[PDB]
Amino acid sequence: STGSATTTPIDSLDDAYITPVQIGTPAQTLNLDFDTGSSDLWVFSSETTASEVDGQTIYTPSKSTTAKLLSGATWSISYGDGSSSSGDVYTDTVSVGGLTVTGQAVESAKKVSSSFTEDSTIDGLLGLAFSTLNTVSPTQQKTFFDNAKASLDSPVFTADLGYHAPGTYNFGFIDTTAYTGSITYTAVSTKQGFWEWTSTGYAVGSGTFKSTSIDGIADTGTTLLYLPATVVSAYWAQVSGAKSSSSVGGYVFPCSATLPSFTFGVGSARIVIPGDYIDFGPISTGSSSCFGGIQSSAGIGINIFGDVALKAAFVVFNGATTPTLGFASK
């Protein structure tokens, strides 16, 4: 089997991406944020505290003939940014892009943080990191990809995020029309439950490539590119008037600037992030200070190749017995 679904940025600056997912029978379609940095599939629901719902579509298990309470099960997740949610669990039929999983754990939110509530376009999360990070207790649950894997033509999914445009998530096949050149595969460590890999270095604009190992994760859930402070300083030093602002919490640049590209290594290959991709717009409406897309990881504890980096590539998440990542230009 395979599946193919379009993923659409929620706003004009690609602050996040949503992908329609069918849950239940008859289908309830919710727009979920596909997250390769977490492992829970959770949704706004008929159980979510009413004051914490502001425009999201909700899952109503009582309206699904295939829903079953996973009795006793609970979940609770705190993401790096201090965003949180928690609740109980149902199993139901979930379909993404024509690929169906029966008995998928669908984690129903009872509580969500204000950040989730205000994000009216995002009805929940679909985690695609390793199932060892799933937060369901007392019986940990599998991701949609782990449940689908045995049925797929190839045990892979691919992320093809657009710049200011829709893109695609495919499951079970590699669309050889979706990229240019060849895919360069690189080793993954699953020790922390993430798609963790080592980049071979970076360049700023037209500058020389610096060969240096940068461990990090491939995380569609994260909007920006978080790298060591040395790398990030080297980037923003090439932008007149860029600075790190404690008041904003990281790098801002003049909205009159033209940003340089950023290149990252994947083995002997190179992925170029155009400068435009690193411009996340005014820090407040009308401001002439714009929010940088490359930020320091130093206050995180991990480097994160988030959407700013991933959208520059066709990315293969190979879930073979020995997982690997693949990157191609596009």
Ligand SMILES: Cc1cc(NCc2cccnc2)nc(N)n1
């Ligand atoms: C899931 C998601 C991410 C995101 N990132 C950009 C962001 C983060 C914090 C402050 N200002 C902008 N923005 C939204 N709306 N949803």
Ligand SMILES: Cc1cc(NCc2cccnc2)nc(N)n1
């Ligand atoms: C995948 C994902 C979504 C999310 N949504 C909440 C949110 C955060 C920032 C701005 N607006 C909303 N928070 C996180 N950490 N990951």
Ligand SMILES: Cc1cc(NCc2cccnc2)nc(N)n1
């Ligand atoms: C994405 C983005 C927006 C922006 N807005 C500020 C602006 C520009 C032009 C006219 N009036 C206001 N500046 C930049 N550089 N990038």
